[PDB]
């Protein structure tokens, strides 16, 4: 089909109820994909949530290092545009997984981290603070981390971080965006702030470099962000958008991406809004 046609069907299906029914029918975890490493005794407490685990096939491995991390490669292709948007989707680090988190960032010289959670919710810790408050310097697994800049906007905090390899003396800079106006299991507090943030993240991509995206579990709010970026690329290229195909494609790489029906409805509505705003 076409962008126009897909948007007609999405509009109609939003009004029907059919897009939500097909969403609830979709598997959360792809049947047949092995999940073994994540459940080993030495790895169980490296998962923030017992039921949010990486598939073996797309699990991120540390270079020449056997340590496990709960993280998944997630790549979204737009073949008609010879385009692949790469991500590493991961959980909020735990105190004892900060070393592995920063090792992924170092291994792959990732320049952009997108964090879609506050540190705490309702008196409980949802992500370890794996960076230091400026101007402190923090050690994690033989990386020193310092926050060189910290600036708050409405909806998010932008930090520039310096990662130093203690073994080698090498340095790497990372941009870190913490979206703080988006509670777990919910929709963003403001749709317009969210859309602007997504387009800002797009603009900060480095060629063929994955964006590291995480939340607390790294599936709900991350899935929404990924869905939206994908849809923005498609809409700008006049290509059809099937949100269910996009969610399925993510879930073939990391189970459970896009947690709630309310999140799926939100992103479908936002996709329609962007198409219509942009339509000439």
């Amino acid at each position: 089909d076409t962008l126009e046609g897909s948007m007609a069907q999405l509009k109609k299906g939003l009004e029907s109820g059919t897009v939500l029914i097909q969403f609830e029918q979709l598997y959360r975890k792809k049947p047949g994909l092995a999940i073994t490493f994540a459940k080993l005794p030495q790895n169980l407490d490296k998962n923030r949530y017992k039921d949010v685990l990486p598939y073996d096939t797309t699990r991120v491995l540390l270079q020449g290092n056997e340590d496990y991390i709960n993280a998944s490669y997630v790549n979204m292709e737009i073949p008609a545009a010879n385009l692949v948007n790469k991500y590493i989707a991961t959980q909020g680090p735990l105190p004892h997984t900060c070393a592995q988190f920063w090792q992924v960032v170092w291994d792959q010289k990732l320049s952009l981290i997108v964090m879609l959670t506050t540190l705490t919710e309702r008196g409980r810790t949802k992500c370890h603070q794996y960076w230091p408050d400026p101007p402190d310097v923090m050690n994690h697994g033989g990386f020193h981390i310092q926050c060189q800049s910290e600036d708050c906007t409405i909806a998010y905090v932008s930090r520039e971080m310096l990662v130093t390899n203690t073994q080698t003396g090498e340095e790497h800079t990372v941009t870190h965006l913490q979206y703080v106006a988006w509670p777990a299991h919910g929709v963003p507090d403001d749709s317009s702030d969210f859309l602007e943030f997504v387009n800002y993240v797009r603009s900060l991509r480095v060629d063929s470099e994955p964006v590291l995206v995480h939340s607390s579990a790294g599936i709900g709010r991350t899935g929404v962000l990924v869905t939206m970026e994908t849809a923005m690329c498609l809409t700008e290229r006049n290509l059809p958008i099937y949100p269910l195909d996009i969610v399925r494609k993510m879930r073939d790489q990391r189970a459970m991406m896009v947690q709630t029906s309310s999140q799926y409805k939100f992103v479908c509505e936002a996709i329609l809004r962007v198409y219509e705003e942009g339509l000439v």
């Binding site: 998962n47 017992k50 607390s216």
Partner: peptide
């Protein structure tokens, strides 16, 4: 170990 809440 806890499940991710709904």
């Amino acid at each position: 170990f806890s499940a991710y809440p709904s």
